[PDB]
RNA sequence: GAAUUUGGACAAACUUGGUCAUUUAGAGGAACUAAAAGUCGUAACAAGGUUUCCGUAGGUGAACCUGCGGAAGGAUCAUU
RNA sequence: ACCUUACGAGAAAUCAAAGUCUUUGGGUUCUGGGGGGAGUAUGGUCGCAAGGCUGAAACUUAAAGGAAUUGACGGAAGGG
RNA sequence: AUGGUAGGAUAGUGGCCUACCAUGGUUUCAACGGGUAACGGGGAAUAAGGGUUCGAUUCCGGAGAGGGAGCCUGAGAAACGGCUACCACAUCCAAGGAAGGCAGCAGGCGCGCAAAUUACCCAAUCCUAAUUCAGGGAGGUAGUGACAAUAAAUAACGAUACAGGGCCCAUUCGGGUCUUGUAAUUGGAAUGAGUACAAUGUAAAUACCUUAACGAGGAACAAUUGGAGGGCAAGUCUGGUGCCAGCAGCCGCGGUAAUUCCAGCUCCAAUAGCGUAUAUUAAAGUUGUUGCAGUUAAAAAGCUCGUAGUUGAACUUUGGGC
RNA sequence: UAUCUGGUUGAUCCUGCCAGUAGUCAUAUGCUUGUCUCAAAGAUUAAGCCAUGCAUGUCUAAGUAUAAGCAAUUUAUACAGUGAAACUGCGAAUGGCUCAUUAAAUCAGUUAUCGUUUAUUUGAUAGUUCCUUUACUACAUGGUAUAACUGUGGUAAUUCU
């Protein structure tokens, strides 16, 4: 019930002696509309995607196979495991859960990977489209015979199944404590639920040394992410759920972060998790599943793959498996020189911060890189003076919080409506972002991954003297971070200002870096910041003071990590050249 | 795989399908014998048409032949024992000029009706299906059931049933526990 | 099965007369080209453009049927939705 | 194709074992042994469906595995063992003592035997030659070898074999007047004297035989077990001992009893 | 006793032809059927206004016409 | 070859065979299976040629046909 | 290619192969070629008798594992849930290399007019192994399933009002017993469909069988599918359209009075089933052995000779007696 | 269950076909669908292509055990109970699937091996070997390995090693 479209192949399409065969057959050629348009001289055949029914006679008419029909997302009423309300969005498949194993979800942020998890815990149990009269368990288990699933299920009524999501939300956990107030380490004392010595100590490996005895509330989003893993760790369960780890991670981070989940791994337990970033998932996943569908209208998951194929597949955009093309392939001095607390000295060191020319500014976890951004805008001041006022500042905080009753669009009023020329101006910025979807909805019920969104492009509209964006990589999806780089590219040449962007990410870093500030010191304990050293030579420090390697695909130029012992790690240490396409 | 269950089929319908002789005669065996449907008349002619082939094949073959012999003694004695057969007609000849008057006569349905314990041959169609009719001692709720002639003597109640006693029913109960609640 | 190409006025053959109310479809396994009479009151009213119908004969085993010049099939469903349930109104058509 | 079938599907085992067409695709396939998987009985066909003394296959595993059964004197805990004709089968516990011989329906019997008939048992000798060293021997028709056997003993005649040793007590020579068993073929299950047999050089033998009824019938000689003389067989007969009566002579027979 | 190696039979395949059994395009023809209130005549049906039909040959806007031999299915069962 | 019967036959005209054929078997060879398309295409084969002999299909159609009857008409013959 | 003699190879026989030799071998009684929408058989459907059509598919035999070819191991394989190469697809890759074979069971794409669950289990049937014990998508169990097949609910019974025979009467149009059916007339009884303790069922369940408790009666627990000119059951209707729209397998209907369309009412046929398309069988003595036809309807070759084929007079031991 | 009927004409009798009529372990499709038993089911087109998981393994008193495995003893300082791995032995050639090929081929019934291979099963069956045969020796019992294991490693990756 798919539609089903007529694709042809630059490969073995020859126009000159095929007797252009497809387009005499054509029905809608009959009826006058110029669904293939395709000449003796022509290099290619061309169909129509929008005129073609999809009969498929075209394909047995054609003296090679120069062409195939394959299919395209749609609207299906069928199949449907859970509506959220009337006119909602819709879910239809519902992943299976492998024993053993680690099972990746894939997609487009909005499309329901978190929805499903849900599910699968029993947070949300299914109402197979009925929102009026919710279906009991009894006829649930009975829509799911013939499957795993009805067995799966069953188990979970019968309390043989505990089941644990970790939250993708970081934002909304410090704000409800067992208590009133109490630091991080007491709320992991009383559910360590597994002796500290005789299993793998995870505190040690998921670097919470330090931070065992600040209080909750004041650790940023970087921290506090590897806090949420650590709860969900500690806990004793048959199923674990990861929803968006990656976030707020540093590379070597990102790789111990895979390297924790595999270690919950037994015959008897399930790990499923929902990861956006590529390269993390190579280590992560023995398994990957694509879920599909137009954002926020309707979602559907697909039969799973191994990861080697499973990732090639995602940068394609179509699945071989069930013949649809889900379409996304991927493709001025201010020497502050100080500031303490007194615990984490983040000396700065001088720059020459360069003229209207976008630079990265990228660190680790404890290393404090939002204090310098702090000190950009004035706040956090050093003690011994030397604290120049001259720079104003449009920054964006980590730690986004919504204060106000506001639709969009009015908040579009209330601060960036501006002048609003359409050349080259927020007119032209907005256009690729689908920010014209989310003007109706309120910012307090619009998403995390939206909010996010919306920030950044808030945050650009006022000039200002020097606008800030901090981390603006969390709670996007991987072709959300394509788009969103490319739209902060396109504004930063237009005005003559420049920007500290924050990343915890690296392949973005890397599209979006002419200067480099490196931040080489202990995290956690104090630091010491360098210059805007440039491009090839500034990776490469950060890379040498992590021992990680990255390779350049040579078919699609993907950034992949090395492993930590091999022929081409090895090899580029030797030579010096921790990256490339510099 | 395992072997295939056989069956068979038990009817066949007439070959010219609106003829007015035909349709006014099986609509008087269907209101004299109460039954439901052309199935049950075509369910019998299929039967007679068997058992007159098979009479047919054996009367083509001499006297005294074993065959014939056997055979038409054991289709003679399933004939008369079922009570479709006369007990003086027992000569392989009168089986041919049988008739599904004759068939139909040893139904439960009619049975029930002729010993006098229905009133109807609806009734008795109605009194067999909600199982009020035991042929041994077993409850039989088939109205086509062609008792076998020593079994004629025990048609009566069930045990377990009203009309046979024991416990009134659904809706005599309600009625006595409404006046009962009216008593008090 | 196959694809309407346009919708025919065949009118009828002697002593008869009325316009018939055909279709050209092709044929999605052959890509040959059929004439297929839609055949109640009103029912071309349903068979409007490029859709899936199913055909079938009717009847005289190859040949043209009444009246009607040179066709020998008829339709049957129009878009996965049959012709008389659409005609008594019982179901009714997706948009396309 | 590539090997020996080891499977036996129902539908295509032999029809006198009276196994059901459902409950199950397949049959117990008879193991190698000394007789021809057709003309045989397996241990569990003869426990399970004939003497009930188990309701399943693994049942009479468990028979089996105690060393109750023996057949032919050895322990046999072997499920699809083929017990042929002639073959005694003693069960120690209830201490009885089985012959496998035909009824006249043409399938093997519950034939019930004492103590001291359990001791011996008949053979068919199918071949005399003269083995290595020239030692000469016999092979009976479940396909034992004795060696050193009587020099005026040919082919076709029978040999009663000791059951404790291997050795031979007599024999019956072949010819009129001589008590046989017919196994195989059409007239399987009947007993009748041999009147004469008929040379036919080049194959198939045939013999004519006459019941106590005086009902004359003939068989190939492949099909023929001679039993005895006449008068006197050498083993117990079971019931009905071989006289085929007639559907019309068995159903007023059966309406004498009933 | 490993790599390697000589001859052989078995032989998948490959390259260059050449046949046949299969499709497409195709200037043009060339018919046939159905439906068609068209154009010109009136060949057949009456001795249909030159009896009709057959075979063969030639001719002609079209039916058709004409020569030669035949048939009655003719308009003659018939002239001791 | 003819005349008369109709034993008989046949749809009838008519037939001594076109009879002895549902009461169905003397021997044997050839041909037909609704009307067109069509004795046409195509391939063989014979012929100097003209042509002969073999010989379809797609498609199309509800009749085409036989013998008699009663009318109507005839540039057919008689009568009133 | 057909045979002869020697050898070779094989588990063995043999042009199976080689060397030498001879010129054979098949065919109108249809060889050889072509086609098959051709795996063969048991068998299936439909037939008075004879037949005709089908058989991929529960059993038996064969063959194949994407296409070909080659081989190892072993008793047994030219094995593909074994290996080797080529051809065709196709995956991963760090570009060095590596791994593939669902015409097994599920499942997916594609194709189409067309066909189910990525469930439970070895409890039964049996098979394998060192073996009673382990294993088995073989096999069983449930799911889906109007493919066919069996049985068989959708109501039964009164009391009173309405349309009927001789007679008790021999009391003219008065009760009407003895019935037959209609009722904007009322009554209780009866029961499953369904729901559900329980037990049984089962490897564990589900369901069946059994059974407390509940569960009926007219807007409730409401049977359809095709038809009503003829063939061929069923309109002496009423509105609408007006050669239009449409119906009609065939003949035909429709231009103001439509027995045929579109509807309402009524009625008929089969009925948990009924209609349509395609194919096939009977009807078909329209394939004709039984058993057709050939003057004119289709069809006796222009005429004779003639080989194969088919068909060919009569005759030989009978009668008698026990 | 040995049956026909409508349509060529102004009417008739025929030839003759078309149309109806009944069935189909023949498919498909439409409309409709309460109950019990029973049941086929990706053959037809594409022997087209396959993501994922499973479908072939196996232990007895009775081949090999020092697991640095688990147990409890009390026979037993050589072992002796249970039992992973691994070696050895068997099995993986059966079953299941499909119907492409194939027209004297397969197949069916009927023969033959006096023309041959045969694990297994079952029954029989082996005083002869001190190879130079007075010792040249072990026959109350002869030689090597090698796995699992232990330890050191390579490769992005494999049931690699
Ligand atoms: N709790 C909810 N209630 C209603 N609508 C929701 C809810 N959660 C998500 N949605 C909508 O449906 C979609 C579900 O996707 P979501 O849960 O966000 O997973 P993902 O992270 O893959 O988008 C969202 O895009 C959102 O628009
Ligand atoms: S397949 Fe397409 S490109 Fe090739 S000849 Fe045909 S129409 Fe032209
Ligand atoms: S699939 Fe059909 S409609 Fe589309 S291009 Fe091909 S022939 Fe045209
Ligand atoms: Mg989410
Ligand atoms: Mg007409
Ligand atoms: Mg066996
Ligand atoms: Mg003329
Ligand atoms: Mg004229
Ligand atoms: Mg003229
Ligand atoms: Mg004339
Ligand atoms: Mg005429
Ligand atoms: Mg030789
Ligand atoms: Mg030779
Ligand atoms: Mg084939
Ligand atoms: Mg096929
Ligand atoms: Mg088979
Ligand atoms: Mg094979
Ligand atoms: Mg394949
Ligand atoms: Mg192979
Ligand atoms: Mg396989
Ligand atoms: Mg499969
Ligand atoms: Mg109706
Ligand atoms: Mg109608
Ligand atoms: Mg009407
Ligand atoms: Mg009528
Ligand atoms: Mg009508
Ligand atoms: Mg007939
Ligand atoms: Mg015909
Ligand atoms: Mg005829
Ligand atoms: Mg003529
Ligand atoms: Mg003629
Ligand atoms: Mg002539
Ligand atoms: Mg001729
Ligand atoms: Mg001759
Ligand atoms: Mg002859
Ligand atoms: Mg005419
Ligand atoms: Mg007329
Ligand atoms: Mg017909
Ligand atoms: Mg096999
Ligand atoms: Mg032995």
């Known amino acids: 019930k798919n539609s089903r479209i007529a694709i042809v192949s630059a490969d073995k399409c020859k126009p000159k002696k095929c007797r252009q065969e497809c387009k005499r057959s054509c029905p809608v050629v009959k009826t006058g509309k110029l669904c293939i348009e395709v000449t003796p001289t022509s290099k290619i055949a061309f169909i129509s995607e929008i005129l073609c029914i999809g009969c498929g006679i075209c394909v047995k008419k054609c003296p090679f196979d120069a062409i195939q029909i394959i299919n395209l997302p749609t609207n299906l009423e069928a199949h449907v495991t859970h509506r959220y309300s009337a006119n909602s969005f819709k879910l239809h498949r519902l992943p299976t859960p492998r024993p053993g194993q680690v099972l990746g979800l894939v997609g487009t942020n909005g499309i329901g990977k978190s929805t499903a998890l849900k599910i699968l815990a029993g947070k949300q149990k299914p109402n197979l489209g009925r929102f009026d009269d919710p279906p009991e368990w009894q006829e649930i288990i009975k829509y799911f015979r013939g499957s795993e699933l009805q067995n799966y299920f069953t188990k979970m009524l019968e309390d043989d199944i505990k089941a644990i999501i970790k939250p993708q939300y970081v934002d909304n956990i410090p704000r409800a404590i067992k208590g009133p107030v109490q630091k991080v380490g007491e709320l992991l004392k009383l559910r360590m639920e597994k002796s500290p010595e005789d299993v793998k100590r995870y505190i040690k490996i998921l670097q919470l040394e330090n931070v065992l005895k600040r209080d909750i509330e004041k650790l940023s989003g970087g921290e506090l992410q590897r806090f949420a893993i650590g709860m969900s760790c500690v806990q004793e369960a048959d199923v674990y759920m990861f929803d968006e780890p990656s976030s707020y991670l540093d590379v070597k981070q990102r790789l111990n972060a895979a390297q924790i989940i595999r270690s919950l791994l037994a015959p008897t337990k399930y790990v499923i998790c929902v990861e956006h970033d590529l390269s993390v998932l190579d280590y992560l996943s023995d398994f990957v599943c694509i879920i599909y569908g137009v954002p926020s209208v309707y979602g559907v998951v697909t039969l799973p793959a191994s990861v080697r194929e499973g990732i090639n597949i995602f940068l394609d955009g179509h699945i071989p498996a069930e013949n649809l093309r889900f379409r996304t392939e991927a493709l001025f001095s201010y020497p502050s020189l100080k500031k303490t607390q007194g615990d984490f000295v983040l000396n700065v060191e001088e720059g020459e911060f360069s003229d209207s020319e976008i630079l990265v500014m990228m660190g680790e976890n404890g290393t404090g890189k939002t204090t310098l951004i702090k000190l950009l805008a004035g706040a956090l001041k050093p003690d011994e003076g030397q604290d120049i006022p001259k720079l104003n500042v449009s920054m964006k905080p980590q730690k986004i919080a919504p204060k106000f009753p506001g639709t969009v669009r009015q908040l579009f009023f209330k601060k960036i409506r501006g002048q609003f020329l359409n050349p080259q101006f927020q007119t032209d910025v907005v256009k690729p972002l689908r920010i014209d979807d989310i003007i109706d909805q309120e910012v307090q019920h619009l998403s995390g991954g939206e909010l996010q969104r919306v920030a950044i492009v808030l945050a650009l509209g006022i000039p200002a003297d020097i606008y800030l964006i901090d981390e603006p990589s969390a709670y996007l999806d991987s072709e959300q971070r394509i788009i969103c780089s490319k739209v902060i590219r396109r504004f930063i040449l237009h005005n003559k200002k420049t920007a500290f962007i924050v990343e915890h990410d690296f392949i973005m870093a890397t599209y979006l870096a002419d200067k480099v500030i490196v931040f080489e010191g202990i995290p956690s304990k104090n630091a010491h910041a360098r210059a805007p050293e440039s491009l090839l030579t500034g990776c490469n420090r950060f890379l040498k003071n992590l021992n990680v390697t990255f390779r350049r695909d040579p078919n699609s130029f993907r950034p992949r990590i090395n492993k930590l012992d091999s022929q081409m790690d090895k090899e580029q240490k030797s030579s010096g050249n921790y990256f490339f396409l510099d | ?184 | 099965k196959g694809i309407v190409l346009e919708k025919l006025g065949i009118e009828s053959k002697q002593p008869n007369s009325a316009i018939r109310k055909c279709v050209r479809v092709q044929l999605i396994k052959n890509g040959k080209k059929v004439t297929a009479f839609v055949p109640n009151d009103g029912c071309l009213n349903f068979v409007d453009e490029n859709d899936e119908v199913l055909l079938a004969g009717f009847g005289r085993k190859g040949k043209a049927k009444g009246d009607i010049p040179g066709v020998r099939f008829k339709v049957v469903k129009v878009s996965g939705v049959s012709l008389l349930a659409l005609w008594k109104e019982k179901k009714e058509k997706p948009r396309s | 194709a590539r090997g020996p079938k080891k499977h036996l599907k129902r539908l295509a085992a032999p029809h006198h074992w009276l196994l059901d067409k459902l409950s199950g695709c397949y049959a117990p396939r008879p193991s190698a042994g000394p007789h021809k998987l057709r003309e045989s009985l397996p241990l569990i066909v003869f426990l399970r469906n004939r003497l009930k003394y188990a309701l399943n296959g693994r049942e009479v595993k468990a028979i089996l595995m105690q060393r109750h059964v023996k057949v032919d004197g050895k322990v046999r805990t072997d499920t699809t063992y083929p017990a042929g004709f002639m073959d005694v089968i003693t069960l120690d516990a209830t201490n009885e003592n089985f012959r496998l011989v035909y009824d006249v329906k043409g399938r093997f019997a519950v034939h019930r035997i004492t103590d001291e008939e359990a001791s011996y048992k008949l053979g068919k000798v199918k071949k005399v030659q003269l083995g290595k060293k020239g030692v000469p021997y016999v092979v009976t028709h479940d396909g034992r070898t004795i060696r050193y056997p009587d020099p005026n003993i040919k082919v076709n005649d029978t040999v009663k074999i000791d059951l404790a040793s291997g050795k031979i007590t007599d024999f019956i020579k072949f010819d009129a007047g001589k008590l046989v068993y017919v196994t195989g073929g059409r007239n399987l299950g009947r007993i009748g004297t041999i009147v004469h047999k008929e040379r036919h050089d080049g194959g198939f033998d045939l013999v004519h035989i006459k019941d106590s009824l005086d009902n004359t019938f003939v068989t190939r000689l492949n099909n023929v077990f001679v039993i005895g003389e006449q008068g006197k067989p050498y083993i117990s007969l079971p019931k009905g001992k071989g006289i085929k009566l007639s559907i019309a002579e068995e159903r007023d027979r059966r309406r004498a009893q009933q």
């Open chain 2, 1 to 184: 795989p395992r072997a295939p269950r056989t069956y068979s089929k038990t009817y066949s319908t007439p070959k010219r399908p609106y003829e007015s002789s035909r349709l006014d005669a099986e609509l008087k065996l269907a209101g004299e014998f109460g039954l439901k449907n052309k199935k049950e008349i075509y369910r019998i002619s299929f039967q007679l048409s068997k058992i007159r082939r098979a009479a047919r094949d054996l009367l083509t073959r001499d006297e005294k032949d074993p065959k014939r012999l056997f055979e038409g003694n054991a289709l003679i004695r399933r004939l008369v024992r079922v009570g479709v057969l006369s007990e003086d007609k027992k000569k392989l000849d009168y089986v041919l000029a049988l008739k599904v008057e004759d068939f139909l006569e040893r139904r439960l349905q009619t049975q029930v009706y002729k010993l006098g314990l229905a009133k109807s041959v609806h009734h008795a169609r109605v009194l067999i299906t909600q199982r009020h009719i035991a042929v041994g001692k077993q409850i039989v709720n088939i109205p086509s059931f062609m008792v076998r002639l020593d079994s004629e003597k025990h048609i009566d109640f069930a045990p377990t049933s009203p009309f046979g006693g024991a416990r009134p029913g659904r809706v005599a109960r309600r009625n006595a526990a409404r006046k009962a609640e009216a008593s008090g």
